[model samples]
Target chain A: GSMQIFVKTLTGKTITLEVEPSDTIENVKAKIQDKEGIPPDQQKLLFARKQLEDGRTLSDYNIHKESFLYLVLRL
Target chain B: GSNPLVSERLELSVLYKEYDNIYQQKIKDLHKKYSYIRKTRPDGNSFYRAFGFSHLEALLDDSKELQRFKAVSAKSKEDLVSQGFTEFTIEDFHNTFMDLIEQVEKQTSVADLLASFNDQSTSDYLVVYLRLLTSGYLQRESKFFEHFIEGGRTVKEFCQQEVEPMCKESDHIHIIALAQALSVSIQVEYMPHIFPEGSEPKVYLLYRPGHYDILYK
Candidate 1:
């Protein structure tokens, strides 16, 4: 079973991802890539003002239940 | 906040007069070697802004050093990519950075460099790339830097929070890391730290607690 998370782009729109607590930050970025054409490397996911790293799991950061990760692009 | 991102070069005495604290005395003492100052906005990006502007401005007069720096900068993206920075993200910054350096190769005037640094988007992107270079160095040399990080945070976390983000004030650690990363020397006044020690500095900055401004000799 997967839980849903939100990614708010700097454009002020939110993206929803179906993810599991075990999903790595890299894996979550892949999901985002699947939904949007945006490349994973171009994504900067920040939750609670902390930039998420590629190796950490969602559970590591205690993200759950519609948590919004702000997406900052390189551009 | 209303100050320009980078100010026009002014007499060093202007900086001495603007302060009424410990820095004033430091600035007075500084006049023996330095004669001008260019102030950067007090935002979090001041250190990077000051360093970027000061270095490029100097490169305008030093063709040999300009070519050396351009080669290092051109290869920086691949090095950072090897360290796990997203190439797509770093590419844009590397391009912007190279563009700035190319202008130096073309002998862009000091006023032109000043205008580039004062432009918000151009200046901020340059700052971001400098921050990435600093973070990449700290992470690559984690074993040594790890000892300096307090709060039990890993070097990666420190980079994510303190190094990568804009508006985060730089410390001695950052100064050391960036100077080492770019193979450029920095001298920060306010009791002074010649980053990497014993090297002739390529850039000089005036440090005032949370912010940095440019110093000229």
Candidate 2:
């Protein structure tokens, strides 16, 4: 089952990302890319002041339902 | 047609003609040493793109320099890895970076090189890797670089916001770090400052206020 999480961008807009806690950060970025048009390589996602690594999973970071993550785009 | 990632060689006067007396004089003064300019897209990646194209173009003519650069580049991945960048996070860009260098090693033609830069996918990956190198260098020497960062950001934070992100225009810190990181000398013309202070420049670039393009003597 997937959980809906909120991603806040640098522009102060929040995007709801439906992500599985078991999904890799790259998987989550791919979802963002599909939903918001930013490339996977250009997205930097942050949770609890930590930059998420592409290879790590949401569960690895204990990210849960309705968690708020920050998105910083390259450039 | 839309502008390519890097433009064709343009006369020095192309720049002088666009501005009034003050800046025109500046461009004319620049003409004393540089006769041509090759502009890169102004999309914040211009500095890296400009530097990469000009350096690789030069390497095509200098085998010894190419060998030296090839070795330096081949070893840089380990440097970044040691600096705490996970291998997977940087491997894709690093591979693209080395592929372009190998193209130079194989004696690629100027036209082919130009076409490579014009291809957005190939071009931006190069820019991304160069930016990563600059960030890695800054972080490696954080104590020294921290003094140069404004607004109270730590060296790592400064690199995160300014050096790693795409479309973030490079500053002096980025130039210095990248030049040092790659062991390449660059001369940014528009008043003549060479990165790393006094090393001979292998790549020449034109710097207008916020943008960079290639320069030819």
Candidate 3:
């Protein structure tokens, strides 16, 4: 099953995107940019308790299948 | 039971007077008076107390109509110079009040305005109030009396000083400090009304802002 990635925008809008277990975090960023027009460089991504650093693939975290990824925008 | 009509009216009057005193004191202390151009009863309330920036009246009226609350308004600088409030027509008052509302809306922040409802059991009202005050949907009464007022220190400085410190302090003080910080920042103009009516008044932190995550102790 795919995981639900919740993206909250600065304008107070929340977007939930479904992602496959095999997808990279970069893939999620690309989807967000396409849908919300928010550039990846301007966005910060966080999963679990820690922020996802640059150059690290999402698979490194071994995120469980069918789990939820919560993302909040830092203003 | 208290007669609803008399009790409500009297309570309302008291509320208005309290609001007026706070507003006037703030104006005096801040030395910044918003110009009042006209008299307008934007809501069901009478026109006697309505005045402020021209554009704000409508918003004030609408909010009061919905909530049955009232606050003081002032005349505009331009209008004061030309015709003055003494000569204000009914239409002029309405227009000026509307202008004031518009300006307030533009200047305040939603977060701060939402924080005003800390007085309520749930944090919702504080949140809305804070957003309005910070967003400029509401005007802050200038500080008048230098005495220690309830809710310690003004909002902006309180958040930076007291709130930050309390966050690291004991949990109980942290909650009180956070509430006090939020309440002041939202421009609630708290008076120690709940204290013993005749007791010597002491300033204490009462309300907190909305955005804070501190748990009530």
Model 2: chain B TM-score relative to the native chain B: 0.95
How far residue B210's Cα lies from its native spot in candidate 1, in Å, is 0.2
User: Candidate 3, residues A1-75: lDDT per residue as tens digits?
Assistant: 176656643222456777766666768777788887766775666554356665565677776544444443321
Quality of model 3 by C-alpha lDDT:
0.32
What is the RMSD, in Å, between candidate 1 and the native fold over all Cα? 15.6
Candidate 1 stretches with Cα past 4 Å from truth are A1-75, B20-25
**Clash list (residue pairs), candidate 1:** B44-B167
How much is B62 displaced in model 2, in angstroms? 1.0
Distance from true location, Cα of A28 in model 1, Å: 48
Cα misplacement distance, residue B131 of candidate 2 (Å): 0.4
Model 2 spans > 4 angstroms off: A1-75
- The Cα error of candidate 1 at residue B50, in Å, is 0.4
Residue A33 C-alpha lDDT in model 2: 92
lDDT of 3 by residue, B16-50 (tens): 35354545554343223222112211211111111
Higher-lDDT candidate of 1 and 3: 1
